[PDB]
Design a protein around this ligand. Sequence first.
Ligand SMILES: Nc1ncnc2c1ncn2[C@@H]1O[C@H](COP(=O)(O)OP(=O)(O)O)[C@@H](O)[C@H]1O
Ligand SMILES: NC(=[NH2+])NCCC[C@@H](N)C(=O)O
Ligand SMILES: [Mg+2]
Length: 356
Amino acid sequence: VDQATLDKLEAGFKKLQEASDCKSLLKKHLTKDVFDSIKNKKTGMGATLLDVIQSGVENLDSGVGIYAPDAESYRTFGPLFDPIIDDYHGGFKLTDKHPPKQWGDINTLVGLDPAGQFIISTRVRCGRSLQGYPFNPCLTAEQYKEMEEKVSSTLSSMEDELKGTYYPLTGMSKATQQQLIDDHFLFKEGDRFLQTANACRYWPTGRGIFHNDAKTFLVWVNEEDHLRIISMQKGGDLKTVYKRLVTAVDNIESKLPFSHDDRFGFLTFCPTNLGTTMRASVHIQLPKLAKDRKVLEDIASKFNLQVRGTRGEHTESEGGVYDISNKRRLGLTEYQAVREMQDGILEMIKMEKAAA
Ligand SMILES: Nc1ncnc2c1ncn2[C@@H]1O[C@H](COP(=O)(O)OP(=O)(O)O)[C@@H](O)[C@H]1O
Ligand SMILES: NC(=[NH2+])NCCC[C@@H](N)C(=O)O
Ligand SMILES: [Mg+2]
């Protein structure tokens, strides 16, 4: 680690210390003790602590504030990742290991809103990383295209319901891009947290989206993660959505080699996405409980749920519509993760009916 990087690290650490109202996990867990132990370390690909923490230093409103430039980073800079991971995922000890993949018994899932008065739409996603490829900040332009090629070529082999077409972001019209985003299908452009993590180089090269014609099955290519595998539809039929996601992931896994870790499960660019990599969410209205989103979030948190805006994280609710999902992804199975969303949402609905 060259002096120039150390200076910036020392300066970044200071900025974090001074931010009295900063509430990031980065600030909370990057103590003086922790910092000194790992600030001089570097990975085989040349990733430093600066690469890890830089997004959180520049964006003080971060909830987490760190990313892994490569797989090695999770251990090289373990003393920072470990406590942050433990905090976010609601408990994960040094001696803990993420459990084996287990979708569980899908038929044990129930109807979340038969009368259709609360839930607008349901979505479940997972993420995967390709073996032999580092995370965004270490990729070259050429690497983005190979990955784009391999993944797009693989998904052309999807069959039946999952059969679809790959649409590169390159060549996609501005009008078309915005419509896909407004409809909650395509990842947004220009995320300040990712940019400062050097996750958006060469944009939009290598980026795109695969989906079936109904747009119930989608794959994001080369956004935050190499792949995001997505099932979603209008209404509240979580059972169908989850079953479709499983089918897709199982088929894709048989074709593409993904990075998996004995302790951290499936690897992702952000530590919040480790393990199951699963985020099961609904777009839901809860007018009595939502009359102050800060109250809503407090209710959600006790159920291990996270609240996001209608257009995703870092956005406001529109028309009283909130995105509510399981927060935890690591140290629990896929089934347990999806059940936490189900169970929490079922209870929040119970509370909504009982509310004044
Ligand atoms: N339950 C849902 N129903 C409909 N659209 C959703 C749902 N959950 C997320 N989305 C959409 O997915 C897109 C990705 O947003 P993010 O909040 O970044 O999710 P991810 O876990 O996919 O990174 C956003 O446009 C958001 O509208
Ligand atoms: N990985 C992801 N898409 N969201 C998790 C939080 C990201 C981090 N930049 C933050 O502190 O917002
Ligand atoms: Mg996202």
